[PDB]
DNA sequence: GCTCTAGCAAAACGACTTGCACAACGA
DNA sequence: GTGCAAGTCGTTTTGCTAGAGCTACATGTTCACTGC
DNA sequence: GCCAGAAACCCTCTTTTTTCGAGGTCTCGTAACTTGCTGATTTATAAGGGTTTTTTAAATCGTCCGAAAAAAGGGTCGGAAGCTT
């Protein structure tokens, strides 16, 4: 459950892509990037504004 | 530690090999008193580095100066990993490297392509194998004392009959099958002697019961020992006598055959019945191989067939 | 496991290591080599799966467990002299490299049977030697005259002179009645190649030194490159199961001659240009080795070597 | 003095190159690899043998 | 002798807490 | 309110030290069918 | 017969859930106290000057720690020198 390995393929010239991930996919995003900082503080205060547009 | 008196082959373990003051020296827990100091260094010697050992490039230089073959093998010396290639003695090569070229490859190839002679070699292999069965199962009572008490008259009759069959049949295809039938009967006899109950020989390691696993380990060690024999003789592994001409590593299996049923099989059943550890089994096998002079026998056989084939 | 490790086809592994002043050991299940760094000892990784062979130089030592792993992966280990010198040499004896071939990884049984089938008749050997040289000539032409990389790097060569030299030598090869004449042609071919390479590279006059004793950069690089070629040849001949001893051309002054016979395929088609090229740049032995291995990878030297051995065995039927 | 950055270039299909290193070059070998482990313990033991070949 | 395993301690590392400045200097 | 910086402090990673074991698990053949 | 999906089995991490342990805390039971009897024998004591042992501070020594200083290294800018044009 702790395994998190990402494999990137350089297609040559200007392009590269993500082939596969082994283990916890949540440690990477779709393009294979990794978050740089993590917090449990309540950033992104969704509670403040609501969708009742009318 | 002299692993084969016929080949001047030595096994080194728990020591570093290095060169200090221009002489190759062994750094060992016994210091000056280790037996390794009695190792003769000459073009006749061949080393087998064992478990827990390391060697310096400088040593490789001095050994090359003296022309000493080197090879790395696992515990007890059975699994041979890597070694120096040994030269071939013919009139068109002629380097002055002081390395004792060995002429057995030319003898081997001189007949390997002639099928009739190849068959004659196969017969010779099996004659040796059977006679080593009769010897270890009956003539020597060490196994008897250890607990491998088995009937003699049935075994002697079966071996006599198979020997009578060896002198007949036209092609490899029969010899293989005759051996297989003898194998089955030997398995049955061993199981009866051991009171192991019914036994069926699974292959490709699909078995689960102790007998099967111990047989696999024993065979693995036997193959390693045969590989050492061939390497000492310089014959490549592909020039099989009794296995198929397309079998990768056939020759070693041909050579390994002359001990499996003589020395490995009884020990596999004995240890399984005794409930030994795998490590205990391994140690017992190596002890049996040492007691029987197995490597020397398999060397003598290959030399004998070469000389006989002329 | 012994399987699931020899999956990279040997003709496509992308490394070949040269090591000095280090100890090759096993650590945490991995095969590593350690170097003294003053502050600390530094462990360095060795990817046995993507490795053709190791060359170990001066002040270097190896441990048994590492041999077990390398043998499993089918990697050759070779003990050699320091950075371009024989491991051993005295009077008129030389031992360039001492090879430790794996013995627990059984190898195919056909190429060996063909080779040993024809190896015991001098005429058939001579035909094999002819095939080796014709392949060498072919590689020389293709590489020198049809490679954009070498040209762009600054290896501008006289096409006409090279062509006539190739044609002249090839005809002489056909005329070759026996080995001695063949070797003389080899010698004449070789230096004419040196001459062409040098003055095409603005190096000026040059001469090939003897038994790795050269002083100028060109000779030192050539001597060093030879070992890289030896390494690739040794693995090429092993992966087909052919014993090193069964040489065809250089056998009667060398132990394990067949390695050298094979190496000639690549000695001159590559290496030789790169050596002079680096000398021009004032490069450093570390750089020359790096660039040389890059060229060997790009040109698929090992694949060409393996194909040629298959063919010549094949062709002897 | 703690800074150590290595920059690799993929000049094409199945080949890569090392461009430059910023900072402490001792953190890499010539090809730009990085050691797996290091220890102040004397593992090499070069003291044991000497070069007096005669 | 060589390597692996278990237990320890030091150091590195990243997130949290608090107090506070409130920036970015060719034409 | 947003972000910086100085100080804290819980993990987490590395290396050090004793101590103990010492592996590496089928291998009857020939040939027809299947991938790049 | 081919293909697909689902299900049974193996291993380890992460998180609650339970359990356990230390320990802390309170309250009442009770074996050994206290109070009361007599008379022969043993022990303590009122003052103060001269005299042993321990406490206490100061000094010294050693160790440890931290801070400062010095060294080392990464890098930039400008100037001078060498080479080429």
From Swiss-Prot, chains A, D:
Family: In the N-terminal section; belongs to the CRISPR-associated nuclease Cas3-HD family. In the central section; belongs to the CRISPR-associated helicase Cas3 family.
Membrane-traversing stretches: none
Record-given protein name: CRISPR-associated nuclease/helicase Cas3 subtype I-F/YPEST
Organism, scientific name: Pseudomonas aeruginosa (strain UCBPP-PA14)
Disruption phenotype: Infection with phage DSM3 inhibits biofilm formation; disrupting this gene restores biofilm formation upon infection with DMS3 infection. Normal biofilm formation in the absence of phage infection. Decreased production of crRNA in the presence or absence of phage. Disruption of the entire Y.pestis-subtype CRISPR region disrupts crRNA production but does not alter phage resistance (possibly OLNs PA14_33350 to PA14_33310, plus the flanking CRISPR loci), indicating this CRISPR is not involved in phage resistance.
Known function: CRISPR (clustered regularly interspaced short palindromic repeat), is an adaptive immune system that provides protection against mobile genetic elements (viruses, transposable elements and conjugative plasmids). CRISPR clusters contain sequences complementary to antecedent mobile elements and target invading nucleic acids. CRISPR clusters are transcribed and processed into CRISPR RNA (crRNA). Cas3 plus Cascade participate in CRISPR interference, the third stage of CRISPR immunity (Potential). In this bacteria Y.pestis-subtype CRISPRs do not confer resistance to phage DSM3 or MP22, but instead are required for DMS3-dependent inhibition of biofilm formation and possibly motility.
Subunit structure, interactors included: Interacts with Cas1.
Residue range from the parent sequence: 55 to 108 of 1076
From Swiss-Prot, chain B:
Domain of life, per lineage: Bacteria
Regulation: Inhibited by EDTA.
Enzyme nomenclature, EC number: 3.1.-.-
Bound cofactor: record note: Mn(2+) supports cleavage of ss- and dsDNA, while Mg(2+) only supports digestion of dsDNA in vitro.
Cofactors named for this entry: Mn(2+); Mg(2+)
Enzyme class, first EC level, given as a word: hydrolase
Binding of Mn(2+), residues: 179, 243, 257
Keywords: Antiviral defense, DNA-binding, Endonuclease, Hydrolase, Magnesium, Manganese, Metal-binding, Nuclease
InterPro entries: Cas1, CRISPR-assoc_Cas1, CRISPR-assoc_Cas1_C, CRISPR-assoc_Cas1_N, CRISPR-assoc_Cas1_YPEST-subtyp
Family: Belongs to the CRISPR-associated endonuclease Cas1 family.
Role according to the record: CRISPR (clustered regularly interspaced short palindromic repeat), is an adaptive immune system that provides protection against mobile genetic elements (viruses, transposable elements and conjugative plasmids). CRISPR clusters contain sequences complementary to antecedent mobile elements and target invading nucleic acids. CRISPR clusters are transcribed and processed into CRISPR RNA (crRNA). Involved in the integration of spacer DNA into the CRISPR cassette. Acts as a ss- and dsDNA-specific endonuclease.
Protein name: CRISPR-associated endonuclease Cas1
Lineage: Bacteria, Pseudomonadati, Pseudomonadota, Gammaproteobacteria, Pseudomonadales
UniProtKB/Swiss-Prot annotation, chain C:
Name of the featured protein: CRISPR-associated endonuclease Cas1
Outcome, altering residue 261 to A: Considerable decrease in endonuclease activity
Family: Belongs to the CRISPR-associated endonuclease Cas1 family.
PANTHER family linked to this entry: CRISPR-ASSOCIATED ENDONUCLEASE CAS1, CRISPR-ASSOCIATED ENDONUCLEASE CAS1 1
UniProtKB keywords: Antiviral defense, DNA-binding, Endonuclease, Hydrolase, Magnesium, Manganese, Metal-binding, Nuclease
Assembly information from the UniProt record: Homodimer. This bacteria does not encode Cas2; Cas1 must interact with a different protein to insert spacers.
Amino acids binding Mn(2+): 186, 250, 264
Matches recorded under Pfam families: Cas_Cas1 (PF01867)
């Amino acid at each position: 459950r702790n395994t998190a390995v990402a494999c990137h393929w350089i297609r040559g010239r200007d392009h590269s892509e993500l082939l596969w991930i082994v283990g916890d996919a949540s440690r990477f995003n779709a393009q294979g990037a990794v978050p740089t900082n993590r917090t449990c503080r309540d950033i992104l205060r969704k509670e403040d504004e609501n969708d009742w547009h009318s | 530690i002299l692993h084969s008196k016929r080949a001047n082959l030595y096994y080194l373990q728990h020591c570093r090999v290095l060169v200090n003051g221009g002489r190759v020296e062994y750094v060992t827990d016994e210091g000056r008193h280790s037996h390794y100091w009695n190792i003769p260094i000459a073009n006749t010697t061949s080393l087998l580095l064992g478990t827990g050992t390391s060697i310096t490039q400088a040593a490789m230089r001095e050994l090359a100066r003296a022309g000493v073959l080197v090879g790395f093998c696992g515990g007890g010396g059975t699994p041979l990993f890597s070694a120096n290639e040994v030269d071939v003695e013919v009139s068109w090569l002629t380097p002055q490297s002081e390395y004792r070229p060995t002429e057995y490859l030319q003898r081997w190839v001189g007949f390997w392509f002639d099928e009739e002679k190849r068959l004659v070699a196969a017969r010779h292999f099996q004659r040796a194998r059977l006679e080593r069965i009769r010897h270890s199962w009956l003539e020597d009572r060490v196994l008897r004392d250890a607990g491998f008490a088995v009937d003699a008259t049935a075994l002697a009759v079966a071996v006599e009959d198979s020997a009578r069959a060896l002198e007949q049949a036209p092609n490899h295809e029969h010899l293989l099958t005759e051996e297989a039938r003898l194998s089955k009967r030997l398995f049955k006899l061993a199981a009866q002697a051991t009171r192991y109950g019914e036994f069926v020989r699974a292959k490709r390691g699909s078995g689960g019961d102790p007998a099967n696993r111990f047989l696999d380990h024993g065979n693995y060690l036997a193959y390693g020992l045969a590989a050492t024999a061939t390497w000492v003789l310089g014959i490549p592994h592909g020039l099989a006598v009794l296995h198929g001409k397309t079998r990768r590593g056939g020759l070693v299996f041909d050579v390994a055959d002359l001990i499996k049923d003589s020395l490995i099989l009884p020990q596999a059943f004995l240890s399984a019945m005794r409930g030994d550890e795998e490590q205990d089994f391994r140690q017992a096998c190596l002890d049996n191989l040492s007691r029987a002079q197995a490597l020397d026998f398999m060397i003598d056989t290959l030399k004998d067939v070469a000389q006989r084939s002329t």
